[PDB]
Design a protein around this motif. Structure first.
Motif, PDB file in Angstrom:
ATOM      1  N   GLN A  94       1.530   7.524  16.287  1.00  0.00           N
ATOM      2  CA  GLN A  94       1.517   7.379  14.841  1.00  0.00           C
ATOM      3  C   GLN A  94       0.083   7.464  14.360  1.00  0.00           C
ATOM      4  OE1 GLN A  94       3.643   3.444  14.824  1.00  0.00           O
ATOM      5  NE2 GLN A  94       4.976   4.553  13.396  1.00  0.00           N
ATOM      6  N   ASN A 116       1.866   4.109   8.584  1.00  0.00           N
ATOM      7  CA  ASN A 116       3.161   3.468   8.380  1.00  0.00           C
ATOM      8  C   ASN A 116       4.317   4.432   8.110  1.00  0.00           C
ATOM      9  OD1 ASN A 116       1.755   1.166   8.906  1.00  0.00           O
ATOM     10  ND2 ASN A 116       1.970   0.268   6.851  1.00  0.00           N
ATOM     11  N   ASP A 117       4.120   5.399   7.218  1.00  0.00           N
ATOM     12  CA  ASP A 117       5.137   6.434   7.011  1.00  0.00           C
ATOM     13  C   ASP A 117       4.874   7.619   7.934  1.00  0.00           C
ATOM     14  OD1 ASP A 117       5.492   4.594   4.996  1.00  0.00           O
ATOM     15  OD2 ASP A 117       6.074   6.077   3.485  1.00  0.00           O
ATOM     16  N   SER A 118       5.026   7.392   9.232  1.00  0.00           N
ATOM     17  CA  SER A 118       4.807   8.435  10.229  1.00  0.00           C
ATOM     18  C   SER A 118       5.834   9.568  10.159  1.00  0.00           C
ATOM     19  CB  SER A 118       4.787   7.823  11.627  1.00  0.00           C
ATOM     20  OG  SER A 118       5.788   6.826  11.745  1.00  0.00           O
ATOM     21  N   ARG A 119       7.036   9.264   9.677  1.00  0.00           N
ATOM     22  CA  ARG A 119       8.081  10.279   9.574  1.00  0.00           C
ATOM     23  C   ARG A 119       7.831  11.187   8.374  1.00  0.00           C
ATOM     24  NH1 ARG A 119       9.209   5.265  11.291  1.00  0.00           N
ATOM     25  NH2 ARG A 119      11.223   4.943  12.342  1.00  0.00           N
ATOM     26  N   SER A 160      10.193   9.753  16.253  1.00  0.00           N
ATOM     27  CA  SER A 160      10.243   8.465  16.938  1.00  0.00           C
ATOM     28  C   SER A 160       9.222   8.443  18.064  1.00  0.00           C
ATOM     29  CB  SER A 160      11.644   8.198  17.476  1.00  0.00           C
ATOM     30  OG  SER A 160      11.879   6.809  17.601  1.00  0.00           O
ATOM     31  N   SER A 161       8.338   7.453  18.030  1.00  0.00           N
ATOM     32  CA  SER A 161       7.166   7.455  18.896  1.00  0.00           C
ATOM     33  C   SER A 161       6.510   6.087  19.014  1.00  0.00           C
ATOM     34  CB  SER A 161       6.138   8.429  18.336  1.00  0.00           C
ATOM     35  OG  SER A 161       5.887   8.138  16.970  1.00  0.00           O
ATOM     36  N   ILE A 220      17.525   9.329   2.984  1.00  0.00           N
ATOM     37  CA  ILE A 220      16.173   8.785   2.945  1.00  0.00           C
ATOM     38  C   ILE A 220      15.567   8.900   1.543  1.00  0.00           C
ATOM     39  CG2 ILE A 220      13.785   9.383   3.603  1.00  0.00           C
ATOM     40  CD1 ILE A 220      16.729   8.906   6.023  1.00  0.00           C
ATOM     41  N   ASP A 221      15.385  10.130   1.063  1.00  0.00           N
ATOM     42  CA  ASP A 221      14.670  10.369  -0.191  1.00  0.00           C
ATOM     43  C   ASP A 221      15.348   9.761  -1.431  1.00  0.00           C
ATOM     44  OD1 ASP A 221      12.679  11.711   1.197  1.00  0.00           O
ATOM     45  OD2 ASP A 221      13.608  13.680   0.910  1.00  0.00           O
ATOM     46  N   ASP A 260      21.216  13.457   1.368  1.00  0.00           N
ATOM     47  CA  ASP A 260      20.046  12.852   2.015  1.00  0.00           C
ATOM     48  C   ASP A 260      20.201  11.348   1.953  1.00  0.00           C
ATOM     49  OD1 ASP A 260      16.965  11.748   1.830  1.00  0.00           O
ATOM     50  OD2 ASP A 260      17.099  13.605   2.994  1.00  0.00           O
ATOM     51  N   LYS A 277      11.442  12.912  -5.412  1.00  0.00           N
ATOM     52  CA  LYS A 277      11.674  14.349  -5.465  1.00  0.00           C
ATOM     53  C   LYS A 277      12.918  14.619  -6.297  1.00  0.00           C
ATOM     54  CE  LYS A 277      10.567  13.580  -1.572  1.00  0.00           C
ATOM     55  NZ  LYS A 277      10.481  14.505  -0.405  1.00  0.00           N
ATOM     56  N   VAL A 303       7.270   8.531  -4.101  1.00  0.00           N
ATOM     57  CA  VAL A 303       7.359   9.627  -5.059  1.00  0.00           C
ATOM     58  C   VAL A 303       8.767  10.212  -5.059  1.00  0.00           C
ATOM     59  CG1 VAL A 303       6.367  11.801  -5.821  1.00  0.00           C
ATOM     60  CG2 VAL A 303       4.994  10.198  -4.460  1.00  0.00           C
ATOM     61  N   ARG A 352      -3.890   3.948   6.635  1.00  0.00           N
ATOM     62  CA  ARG A 352      -2.872   2.960   6.970  1.00  0.00           C
ATOM     63  C   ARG A 352      -1.495   3.323   6.400  1.00  0.00           C
ATOM     64  NH1 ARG A 352      -4.429  -1.134   4.457  1.00  0.00           N
ATOM     65  NH2 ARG A 352      -6.711  -0.939   4.291  1.00  0.00           N
ATOM     66  N   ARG A 353      -1.471   3.889   5.194  1.00  0.00           N
ATOM     67  CA  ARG A 353      -0.212   4.341   4.619  1.00  0.00           C
ATOM     68  C   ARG A 353       0.342   5.428   5.503  1.00  0.00           C
ATOM     69  NH1 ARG A 353      -1.255   7.033  -0.804  1.00  0.00           N
ATOM     70  NH2 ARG A 353       0.886   7.673  -0.288  1.00  0.00           N
ATOM     71  N   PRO A 380      11.760  18.122   5.243  1.00  0.00           N
ATOM     72  CA  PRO A 380      11.906  17.716   3.845  1.00  0.00           C
ATOM     73  C   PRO A 380      10.958  16.599   3.423  1.00  0.00           C
ATOM     74  CG  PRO A 380      13.631  16.718   5.177  1.00  0.00           C
ATOM     75  CD  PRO A 380      12.828  17.581   6.106  1.00  0.00           C
ATOM     76  N   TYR A 381      10.670  15.677   4.332  1.00  0.00           N
ATOM     77  CA  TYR A 381      10.040  14.416   3.959  1.00  0.00           C
ATOM     78  C   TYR A 381       8.520  14.490   3.869  1.00  0.00           C
ATOM     79  CZ  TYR A 381      14.732  12.973   5.259  1.00  0.00           C
ATOM     80  OH  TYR A 381      16.103  12.861   5.352  1.00  0.00           O
ATOM     81  N   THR A 382       8.020  15.241   2.893  1.00  0.00           N
ATOM     82  CA  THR A 382       6.581  15.420   2.728  1.00  0.00           C
ATOM     83  C   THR A 382       5.986  14.553   1.624  1.00  0.00           C
ATOM     84  OG1 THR A 382       7.013  17.373   1.349  1.00  0.00           O
ATOM     85  CG2 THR A 382       6.491  17.744   3.670  1.00  0.00           C
ATOM     86  N   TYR A 383       4.695  14.263   1.749  1.00  0.00           N
ATOM     87  CA  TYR A 383       3.937  13.617   0.685  1.00  0.00           C
ATOM     88  C   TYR A 383       2.738  14.486   0.362  1.00  0.00           C
ATOM     89  CZ  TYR A 383       1.231  10.175  -1.947  1.00  0.00           C
ATOM     90  OH  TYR A 383       0.521   9.514  -2.923  1.00  0.00           O
ATOM     91  N   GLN A 414      11.876   2.140  16.988  1.00  0.00           N
ATOM     92  CA  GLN A 414      11.403   3.354  17.684  1.00  0.00           C
ATOM     93  C   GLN A 414      11.429   3.249  19.212  1.00  0.00           C
ATOM     94  OE1 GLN A 414       8.024   5.663  15.712  1.00  0.00           O
ATOM     95  NE2 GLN A 414       7.958   3.785  14.473  1.00  0.00           N
ATOM     96  N   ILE A 415      11.602   2.045  19.745  1.00  0.00           N
ATOM     97  CA  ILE A 415      11.847   1.913  21.177  1.00  0.00           C
ATOM     98  C   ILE A 415      13.029   0.995  21.466  1.00  0.00           C
ATOM     99  CG2 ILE A 415      10.943   1.389  23.466  1.00  0.00           C
ATOM    100  CD1 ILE A 415       8.149   1.870  22.466  1.00  0.00           C
ATOM    101  N   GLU A 422       0.803  -1.225   0.000  1.00  0.00           N
ATOM    102  CA  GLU A 422       0.000   0.000   0.000  1.00  0.00           C
ATOM    103  C   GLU A 422       0.842   1.285   0.000  1.00  0.00           C
ATOM    104  OE1 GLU A 422      -2.665  -0.025   3.317  1.00  0.00           O
ATOM    105  OE2 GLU A 422      -1.080  -0.254   4.819  1.00  0.00           O
ATOM    106  N   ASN A 423       2.040   1.220   0.576  1.00  0.00           N
ATOM    107  CA  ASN A 423       2.927   2.386   0.636  1.00  0.00           C
ATOM    108  C   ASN A 423       3.435   2.819  -0.736  1.00  0.00           C
ATOM    109  OD1 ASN A 423       3.718   2.742   3.848  1.00  0.00           O
ATOM    110  ND2 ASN A 423       3.237   0.620   3.262  1.00  0.00           N
TER     111      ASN A 423
END
Lengths: 49, 99, 292, 387, 162
Positions: free
Chosen positions: E25, E76-79, E19-20, C150-151, C148, C47, C45, E72-73, E105-108, D334-335, C41-42
């Motif tokens: 989340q 999962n991508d909480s960051r 981190s959480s 990550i991206d 970076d 950049k 995109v 749900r997506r 930076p990490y936007t959707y 995360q933990i 599902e993820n």
């Protein structure tokens, strides 16, 4: 006897539990054990209690 | 039963772990036997696995349930709180000894 | 001096890149054929990649002949490289960057401070083209220049798993890779790749222009993808196996996602944080050159 | 008077001591109202977990008993270097090397300590197994071919905790409305060919899928098994099955979790049936072999550690936090730290990398020199050849 | 969304969980979807978290499967920082104005603002007095009997006569 973990027998807060397990832990006796096993198969005529 | 589930589930801890052997050798010998289909419930089968032993594993789940139950046992006394903890350790120990 | 053909150095049979597989030296494209994917599902995109920094790190005054190819290849795909930014020898590439430098880059991948007898070397103009960018591997550690981590991996996934439609679109579901697998397939793959003469592929990437370069990008896309695959296993959050009727499917999850994991595992090569910075930088420079 | 010697001189000692290698756990966030220490356990699928932290009643030569009265001598009968009234005694800054060397000695003694047990547990990690009926659903099915299945109790007793360790979503229930694709989805999601039967009856294509892919159905009971399916063949039958052992290695194949190299596999095939006592005896024997005298402080830590009873069951053991409520949590990025995500059979990375080549040695044909079976035949020995 | 000029310090006042725990989340995921209808009623600000968690508990409980998968997506991508296209347009504006500015930076970006009903939310005091309509969009072909659990007189009494 292997009733307790090491140290737990001599632990002071365990004494109630240890007294309880000691209250139930009958000493091993070959006659009593052999009988206990043997009786599992033997026919019973007087109902057991 | 509709609401006694912890009771029933604990009662399942009593279910025998062997099997109902037929007395074939004795039927072969024409030994006396009052049943017309002789049988005896052997307490436990031999370990067909290479390492896992079904009996010790069942006792693991049994001690798992009993420790969860001792842990879910609310008390008032301080000493009862203490033994509530020490019994879980003793349970775990019996588990290894049984294994 | 080895002359560079109308194609790259890669056109020479001497530089051919292959991974061992099913008892033969398979070409990378026929490994990547084994690869299959599971979308989740993820989504990913891509950049725009930030332009690489203009500034070339100074090579220090280094008497020895620094082994730059072993340094880079072990830094990316090496099974046990660590602290790759500490020695800082990648900066030595900058020595090659100058017009008319006395240094030469050996086919061995060693940077000699002067030309030496019986050691074949890449054509210095082409190597200057290559060093002029890749010396920037030298600043992977320095805070003002870090890539970076990550991206950028999105692009990795896009160039690996991505279908031509997903690739033109610039977005793909975060695919989970899988393949029929032998024991230790990923480690042995990583070690087949570590012996690759990647300097050849990078020199051709940085020096070839126009039609020869585009033909190079088409000819070597699977090699690129193979390196990307090893790196993606390095970053994969997990790598499980799946039993499947007397067969085992290796599965890495997920492509295009950097978990930034540092604790090692037997399944794949692992990146110390320095290796993460280095790989990110390498990807920045390489994808930058790969899209122009 | 003493406040300076504390704020200015003890504070540093608490800080350098804070940095020492062996002081690995966090101790106190400084907020009494909500502090609770993190509680890791050494969980095992094949045993009860061992908390690292408990009221075990090992008072450690009396150490764990706390005399608060120690404040009286400290306040009211002890001089400090920082408080002269003023001799100006020069401050001591201890050589790091002493505490460092004892820390390191403890560490190496510990790794070398775990080693023999940790090796055998890796060799046998795939050896845990579940009983499994294989009902046949074809006219000419071999004894192995068919629909694999196991009782739910076996599934709780073995497969489930290992799923929790592998950190995958629990396998789907199959309500008989299930598509083969939903099952394929769960199998590729949990990396394990296991599904839980809930309500009948399972349909044809789903049966062909569970049979063709050897996905293992998990029945609550075997009370009327065929009624739980829909055999168009009418081939399936309650009396028609083959009970057999399913090694965990034949289900799971996570890399650092379950050793599953074909080498280790055939090496297990050579082994006799084992008790936990047998395995324990093997571990003791390897310990007896590899014993080597330690640096003298390491011998002191070994003697002070007490008898190495090792009651712990370590088969596929992990390191997980438990909730205070007592449930063992799945590993959480995360933990929990990355080092706890897999035990790696509790070996050094190099011992793994070497272990690989060794598995390559063990299965070399030239070594395989134990021969099986002989042919008695009454023949002349003309021109003998071993071959 | 009402187009009014806004002097607020940042375009996206929501936190990003670097981190959480799980609850965070999910709070963030449901938080970025803007389910709530506009409400001038005073909130009981103290119970807020519980309320929003209940809202996640409802939003996920009744969303169409694609919306559900979107949450749900997000979970999962909480960051990641999920944000509406107009938000990102505002960010491009402030970057064009002040190039030195740092932004997470990490936007959707959302190509689509999700099609879902706004949820009513008045956490202040006051019993609702619904004026129920005889007919609507839903068609209940056969509904299960609803058993109202009996009330205490502490919560409500019923006198013989008003």
């Amino acid at each position: 006897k292997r009733y307790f973990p090491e140290n737990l027998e001599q632990n002071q807060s365990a004494a109630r539990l240890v007294s309880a397990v000691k209250a139930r832990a009958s000493e091993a006796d070959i006659s009593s054990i052999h009988l206990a096993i043997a009786r599992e198969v033997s026919p019973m005529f007087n109902v057991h209690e | 039963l509709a609401g006694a589930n912890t009771i029933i589930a604990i009662m399942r801890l009593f279910t025998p772990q062997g099997f109902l052997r037929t007395d074939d050798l004795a039927i072969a010998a024409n030994f006396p036997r009052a049943s017309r289909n002789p049988q005896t419930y052997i307490p436990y089968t031999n370990q067909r696995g290479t390492v896992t032993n079904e009996f010790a594993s069942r006792f693991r789940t049994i001690v798992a349930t009993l420790a969860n139950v001792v842990n879910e046992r609310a008390v008032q006394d301080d000493m009862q709180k203490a033994t509530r903890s020490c019994t879980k350790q003793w349970l775990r120990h019996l588990e290894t000894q049984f294994d | 001096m080895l002359q560079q053909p109308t194609g790259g150095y890669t056109t020479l049979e001497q530089f051919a890149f292959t991974i061992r597989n099913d008892g033969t030296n398979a070409t990378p494209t026929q490994f990547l054929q084994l690869l299959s994917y599971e979308a989740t599902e993820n989504e990913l995109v891509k950049k725009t990649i930030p332009t690489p920094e203009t500034h070339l790190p100074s090579a220090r005054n280094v008497p020895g002949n620094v082994y730059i190819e072993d340094a880079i290849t072990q830094a990316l795909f090496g099974i046990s490289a660590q602290n790759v930014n500490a020695h800082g020898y990648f900066s030595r590439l900058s020595a090659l960057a100058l017009p008319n430098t006395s240094a030469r880059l050996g086919l061995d991948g060693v940077i000699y401070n002067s030309e030496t007898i019986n050691i074949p070397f890449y054509d210095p103009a082409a190597v200057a083209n290559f060093a002029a960018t890749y010396a920037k591997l030298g600043n992977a550690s320095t805070p003002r220049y870090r890539a970076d981590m990550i991206d950028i991996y999105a692009h990795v996934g896009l160039e690996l798993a991505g279908t031509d439609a997903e690739r033109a679109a610039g977005v793909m579901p975060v695919k989970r890779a899988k393949f029929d697998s032998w024991e230790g397939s990923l480690i042995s793959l990583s070690r087949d790749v570590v012996n690759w003469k990647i300097l050849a592929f990078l020199i051709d990437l940085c020096s070839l222009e126009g039609e020869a370069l585009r033909a190079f990008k088409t000819r070597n896309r699977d090699v690129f993808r193979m390196m990307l695959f090893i790196m993606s296993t390095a970053v994969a959050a997990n790598v499980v196996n799946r039993k499947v009727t007397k067969r085992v499917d290796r599965v890495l999850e997920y492509i295009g996602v950097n978990s930034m994991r540092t604790a090692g595992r037997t399944a794949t090569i692992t990146y110390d944080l320095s290796r993460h910075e280095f790989a990110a930088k390498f990807l920045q420079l390489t994808f930058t050159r790969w899209n122009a | 008077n003493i406040a300076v010697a504390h704020t200015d001189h003890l504070s540093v000692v608490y800080a350098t001591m804070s940095n020492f290698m062996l002081n690995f756990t966090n101790n106190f966030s400084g907020n009494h109202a909500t502090f609770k220490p993190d509680q890791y356990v050494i969980t095992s699928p094949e045993g009860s977990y061992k908390p690292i932290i408990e009221r075990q009643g090992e008072t450690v030569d009396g150490l764990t008993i706390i005399d608060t009265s120690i404040v009286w001598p400290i306040l009211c009968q002890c001089t400090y270097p920082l408080v002269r009234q003023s001799i100006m005694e020069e401050i001591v800054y201890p050589d790091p090397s002493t505490t460092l060397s004892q820390s390191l000695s403890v560490a190496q003694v510990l790794s070398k300590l775990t080693l023999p047990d940790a090796f055998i547990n890796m060799i046998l990690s795939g050896g845990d197994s579940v009983v499994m009926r294989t009902y046949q659903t074809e006219a000419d099915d071999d004894l192995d071919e068919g629909i694999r299945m196991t009782t739910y109790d076996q599934y709780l007793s073995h497969i489930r905790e290992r799923l929790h360790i592998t950190n995958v979503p629990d396998p789907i229930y199959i309500t008989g409305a299930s598509t083969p694709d939903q099952i394929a989805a769960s199998v590729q999601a949990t990396h394990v060919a296991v599904v839980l039967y809930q309500s009948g009856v399972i349909n044809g294509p789903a049966s062909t899928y569970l049979r063709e892919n050897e996905v293992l159905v998990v029945m609550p009971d075997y009370y009327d098994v065929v009624s739980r399916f829909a055999n168009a063949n009418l081939q399936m039958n309650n009396n028609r099955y083959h009970e057999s052992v399913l090694e965990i290695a034949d289900i799971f194949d996570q890399a650092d979790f379950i050793q599953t190299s074909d080498a280790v596999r055939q090496l297990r095939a050579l082994m006799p049936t084992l008790s936990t006592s047998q395995i324990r005896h093997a571990i003791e024997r390897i310990a007896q072999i590899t014993d080597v005298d330690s640096t003298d402080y390491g011998k002191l830590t070994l003697r002070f550690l007490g008898t190495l009873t090792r009651s712990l069951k370590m088969q596929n053991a992990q390191i997980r936090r438990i909730r205070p409520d007592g449930t063992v949590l799945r590993y959480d990025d995360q933990i929990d730290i990355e080092a706890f995500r897999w035990s790696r059979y509790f070996l050094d990375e190099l011992q793994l990398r070497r272990l690989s080549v060794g598995l390559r040695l063990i299965t070399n044909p030239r070594i395989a020199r134990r021969f099986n079976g002989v042919r008695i035949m009454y023949l002349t020995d003309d021109d003998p050849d071993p071959d | 969304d009402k187009g009014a000029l806004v002097e607020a310090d940042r375009v996206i006042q929501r936190l990003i969980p670097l981190s959480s725990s799980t609850y965070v989340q999910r709070l963030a995921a449901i938080g970025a979807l803007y389910p709530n209808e506009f409400t001038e009623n005073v909130l009981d600000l103290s119970r807020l978290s519980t309320a929003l968690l209940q809202l996640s508990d409802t939003y996920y409980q009744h969303a169409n499967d694609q919306l559900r998968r979107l949450y749900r997506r997000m979970y999962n991508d909480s960051r990641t920082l999920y944000m509406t296209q107009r938000h990102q347009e505002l960010l491009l504006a402030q970057i064009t104005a002040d190039p030195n500015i740092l932004l997470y930076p990490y936007t959707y970006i959302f190509t689509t603002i999700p099609t879902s009903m706004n949820y009513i939310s008045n956490t202040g005091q006051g019993r609702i007095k619904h004026s129920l309509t005889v007919t609507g969009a839903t068609e209940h072909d056969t509904v299960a009997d609803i058993v109202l659990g009996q009330t205490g007189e502490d919560v409500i009494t019923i006198s013989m006569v008003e």
